[PDB]
Design a protein around this ligand. Structure first.
Ligand SMILES: [Zn+2]
Lengths: 199, 209, 49, 78, 149
């Protein structure tokens, strides 16, 4: 009895495999047969073969999904900061307070090359660095860590140790990654979208 | 009786007057902050006063730029508006020399009257609606962004930027609710302000047909 | 020709002409589909068409 | 002033390498020195790394305007 | 006598059923109303309902009642919601593109033989897809030129 019931369920599961793929095939063909033409241009609009605009900016941001390290997002700043910390553990540089952090970053971000960046990204990194500044404040407060650099248990400074060279490296690498996540003009967005919806 | 009906009349006044305000024509905040009870104080009662002209408005002059442009607001009490009523309100509009007239009907329009409402007078516009549509203002809904009508200079700037010809834009059609909401004549462009998962507002432009 | 029984080589259905576009390659598609397979030359008259 | 991106895209890399390989396959002049190489495409990638290729890409905008960029002058990366 | 009992007396003629769904999460242990029916305009014709926060799953309904922009957002929303409802991931840019394509013409044009005719113009790709002979003969009738584009 159980054997027969179990086989009745097994064949039931079996029979759907090919039919689902038939319906998948007549999704695939009719989609790509309509959407394959769309191309992304050097001005960053998306235009039909007749040249008429469809999207003024592709994807609202001009960024290829193939670059997103985060959830549809190009970066995870926690990970990046940890990585940069590990590779360059310079012991000579001093530690910085919230004031030093903010003045150092402001000293750098004002550079024009950053101003060539999407303002939104700059504001977001501002928020990230502001949050870490607040946390380092919390830590030094909870351990009353002297900014003068004079306390005996030197270990106390290792808690949230960061250095200006590290700030420079982190910011420049963030710029690099963001810049290289852009979609390249000439790519066939329509075909990739079609296959992404189909598979 | 028909407490809901009185509430509906209150709400149609509220919403129509908010619409006309948004369209730039003469409205004042003290009017905007009217209350249902205050409206009760103004009006009579559903059985005592009825559907006819009791609290409707025609003060809606083009306070925005030139009050000489003005709208009527008419409340034909008959469930179905016939061509003869169209003539009655046509001579109302002509006598008053008013350029616009917002019409609301209870249960719709006759074919002759429906036909006339596209050819009555090129000089005049008599936008038609039913009370049901006006019970809510579509602008308040979550599922729609804000919009703006763009002046020819701004249109020129945009089409210069990307070097387009207006026919190359995305389209919007005259029959869309928002299009009627603002009475946008075809051959124009409106800016769309799309919200986003982030503060970055998505801005985009669309041509009316 | 058709296949192994009669010396036909391979078939490259629509669903690979799709992936070639996916990558975006153009000279590969042009070659694979008209140069190598069955290229031919014809003559037309401009005046009448 | 030029507006297009200063980096070279995948597609430009592909086509420039392809066409220069076609050229080099024939007896066209060559500039980078060769260590017993025999394949055209390897000569092509050597030169591209050396930025020796005699080509200018003429990018086209949709409206008929255009820019020019020197292959020796774009930003290149692996 | 057999006909009269069927007649409507009260309620929405077009509504089939509704239900008060109830929730329990800490944020709020409250109630919410779910409806089946194909007149979104009708329900917002009522007092009590927070009509500004309504929604109809049907694309045509939202298009009819709120306009094309709401229809577009609903298309993207529904594709993504159904996909995650199963458990798939798909980058939102793809689905955003596909959303806009359907509506750039000022109307929702589905991916159908009818939509395709209303969306493309060249001849061969019509003739390749479906209704070939019809398209061919009508094209010869019109004397259409066709660019290789
Ligand atoms: Zn001839």
């Amino acid at each position: 009895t159980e054997f027969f019931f179990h086989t009745m369920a097994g064949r039931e599961g079996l029979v759907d495999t090919a039919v689902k793929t038939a319906e998948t095939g007549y999704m695939q063909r009719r989609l790509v047969k309509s959407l394959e033409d769309l191309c992304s241009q050097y001005d960053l609009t998306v235009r039909s073969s007749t040249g008429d605009i469809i999207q003024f900016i592709y994807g609202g941001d001009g960024l290829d999904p193939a670059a997103m390290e985060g959830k549809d997002e190009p970066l995870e700043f926690k990970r990046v900061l940890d990585n940069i910390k590990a590779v360059f553990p310079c012991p000579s540089e001093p530690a910085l307070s919230k004031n030093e952090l903010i003045l150092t970053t402001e000293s750098i971000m004002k550079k024009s090359e950053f101003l060539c960046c999407q303002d939104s990204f700059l504001q977001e990194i501002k928020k990230f660095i502001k949050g870490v500044s607040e946390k380092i404040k919390k830590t030094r407060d909870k351990y009353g860590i002297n900014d003068n650099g004079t306390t005996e248990p030197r270990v106390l400074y290792q808690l949230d140790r960061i250095t200006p060279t590290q700030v420079e490296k982190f910011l420049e690498t963030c710029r690099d990654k963001y810049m290289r996540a852009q979609m390249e003009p000439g790519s066939a967005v329509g075909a990739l979208c079609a296959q992404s919806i189909g598979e | 009786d028909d407490e809901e009906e009185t509430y509906r009349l209150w709400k149609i006044r509220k919403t129509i007057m908010q619409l006309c305000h948004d369209r730039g024509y003469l409205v004042t905040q003290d009017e905007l902050d009217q209350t249902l009870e205050e409206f009760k104080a103004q009006s009579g009662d559903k059985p005592s006063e009825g559907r006819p002209r009791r609290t409707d408005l025609t003060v809606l002059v083009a306070h925005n730029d030139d009050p000489t442009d003005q709208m009527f607001v008419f409340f034909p009490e008959e469930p179905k508006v016939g061509i003869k009523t169209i003539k009655v309100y046509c001579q109302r509009m002509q006598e008053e020399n008013i350029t616009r007239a917002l019409i609301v009907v209870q249960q719709g329009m006759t074919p002759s009257a429906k036909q006339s409402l596209v050819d009555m007078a090129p000089k005049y516009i008599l936008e038609q609606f039913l009370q049901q549509e006006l019970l809510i203002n579509i602008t308040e809904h979550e599922l729609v962004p804000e919009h703006v009508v763009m002046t020819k200079e701004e249109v020129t700037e945009l089409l210069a930027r990307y070097k387009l010809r207006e026919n190359q834009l995305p389209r919007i059609q005259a029959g869309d609710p928002v299009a009627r909401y603002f009475g946008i004549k075809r051959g124009q462009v409106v800016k769309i302000i799309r919200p986003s998962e982030t503060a970055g507002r998505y801005i985009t432009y669309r041509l009316v047909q | 020709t058709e296949g192994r029984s009669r010396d036909g080589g391979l078939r490259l259905g629509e669903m690979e002409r799709d992936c070639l576009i996916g990558y975006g390659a153009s000279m590969l598609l042009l070659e694979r589909l008209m140069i190598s397979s069955d290229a031919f030359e014809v003559d037309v008259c401009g005046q009448c068409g | 002033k030029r507006i297009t991106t200063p980096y070279m895209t995948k597609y430009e890399r592909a086509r420039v390498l392809g066409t220069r390989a076609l050229q080099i396959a024939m007896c066209a002049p060559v500039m980078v020195e060769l260590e017993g190489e025999t394949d055209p495409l390897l000569i092509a990638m050597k030169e591209l790394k050396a930025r020796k290729i005699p080509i200018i890409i003429r990018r086209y905008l949709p409206d008929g305007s255009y820019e020019d960029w020197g292959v020796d002058e774009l930003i290149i990366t692996d | 006598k057999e006909d009269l009992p069927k007649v409507v007396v009260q309620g929405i003629p077009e509504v089939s059923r509704a239900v008060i769904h109830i929730d329990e999460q800490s944020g709020k242990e409250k109630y919410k109303l779910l409806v089946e029916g194909d007149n979104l305009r009708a329900v917002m014709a009522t007092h009590g309902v927070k009509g500004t926060r309504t929604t109809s799953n049907n694309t045509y309904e939202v298009e009819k009642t709120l306009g094309i922009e709401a229809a577009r957002t609903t298309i993207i929303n529904e594709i993504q919601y159904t996909m995650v409802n199963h458990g798939m991931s798909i980058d939102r840019r793809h689905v955003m593109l596909l959303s806009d394509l359907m509506t750039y013409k000022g109307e929702v044009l589905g991916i159908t033989r009818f939509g395709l005719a209303k969306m493309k113009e060249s001849v061969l790709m019509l003739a390749s897809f479906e209704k070939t002979a019809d398209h061919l003969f009508d094209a010869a009738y019109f004397g259409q030129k066709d660019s290789v584009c």
